């Protein structure tokens, strides 16, 4: 059974999201960030129950549906506009070397033939990818950190990470490290 | 088996059309529903009429939702008696009340090019309304030209 205050709250959130989407669509999508491409970790948090169609399309294009899912994403103009669309549901920022290293060493899984296996062998990842230049796990570690042409296939290869629910641990540039530190 | 019309007033901003239908559809089946809205600007007048198929469930809903403190509004849920139901009261029921920009239409009609003789109607209207205004301000005294 569902009460009337839930209905009016829902409608108010949907309306506020609708005006906010109209505001960002009307205004020219230029962030206060230099034109150089960067790298940001994105972890999506519980927020609004009902997702508008453009945010759910962007979240599906960024493959974030399940509970506590995280993905690294480039920073250029189009991706800046995409992450500015889905700001209230995601939290993003610059990761650290130990953050990505520990996060892939504790929770790094792979996708092939539409199924998700744990990273068990380097022979497994070499059978999965083969010939784009990656030869081990440290290879995709510094491929994620140091910029290169092999971002897209490596990001499509990796399952996104199902981090454990914390017990209490906008935009920021360095507090995300403590977040994934407590998220793991 | 007669339908029961229900007058709900002091509507909070948000409890408009589909929320009303869902919340009172938990109470029972609704034949029709209509929120009275303004002509010029699409906006609710904090007032609505809901027609249920069953009169008893309408009485139950109106009784247990009458003085409900919802978002700083104390509701007004009163059953309109069957003798006092206006005939075409649910005229715009189960329809969207579209927001139409009347003033933007007026401005882009002011932009719109009239061709040759409607400007002659323009200056004719201008001249005898200037004549009437001239009579009005010659009653008190103020001269103009051109």
């Amino acid at each position: 059974f569902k009460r009337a205050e839930k209905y009016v709250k829902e409608y108010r959130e949907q309306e506020r999201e609708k005006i906010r989407l109209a505001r960002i669509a009307k205004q020219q999508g230029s962030f206060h960030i230099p034109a150089e491409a960067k790298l940001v970790f994105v972890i999506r948090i519980k927020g609004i129950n009902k997702i508008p169609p453009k945010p759910r399309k962007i979240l599906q294009l960024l493959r974030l549906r399940q509970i506590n899912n995280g993905v690294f994403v480039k920073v250029t103009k189009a991706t800046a506009e995409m992450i500015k669309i889905v700001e209230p549901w995601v939290a993003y920022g610059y990761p650290n070397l130990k953050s990505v290293r520990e996060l892939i060493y504790k929770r790094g899984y792979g996708k092939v033939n539409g199924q998700r296996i744990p990273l068990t062998d380097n022979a497994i990842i070499e059978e999965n990818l083969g010939k784009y230049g990656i030869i081990c796990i440290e290879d995709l570690i510094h491929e994620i950190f140091t910029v290169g042409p092999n971002f897209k296939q490596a990001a499509n290869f990796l399952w996104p990470f199902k981090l454990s629910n914390p017990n209490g641990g906008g935009n920021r540039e360095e507090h995300i490290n403590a977040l994934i530190r407590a998220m793991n | 088996s007669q339908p029961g019309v229900m007058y709900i007033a002091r509507l909070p901003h948000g409890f408009y059309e589909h929320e009303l239908r869902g919340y009172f559809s938990q109470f029972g089946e609704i034949t029709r529903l209509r929120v009275v809205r303004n002509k010029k600007t699409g906006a609710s007048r904090h007032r609505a009429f809901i027609e249920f198929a069953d009169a008893e469930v309408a009485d139950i809903a109106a009784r247990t939702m009458d003085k409900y403190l919802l978002f700083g509004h104390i509701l007004t849920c009163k059953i309109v008696p069957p003798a006092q139901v206006h005939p075409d009261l649910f005229k715009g029921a189960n329809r969207r009340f579209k927001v139409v920009p009347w003033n933007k239409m007026a401005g882009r009609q002011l932009e719109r090019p009239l061709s040759e003789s409607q400007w002659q109607v323009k200056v004719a209207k201008e001249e005898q309304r200037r004549a009437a205004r001239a009579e009005k301000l010659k009653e008190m005294g103020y001269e103009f030209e051109a």
């Binding site: - | 008893e56 469930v57 247990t64």
Partner: peptide, 22 residues
């Protein structure tokens, strides 16, 4: 028919007034 509608309306009234939890 009518009895089911009355029972559902009374159940919804009890849920609105006295709540759902316990």
């Amino acid at each position: 028919s009518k009895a089911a509608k009355g029972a559902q309306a009374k159940k919804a009234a009890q849920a609105a007034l006295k709540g759902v939890h316990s």
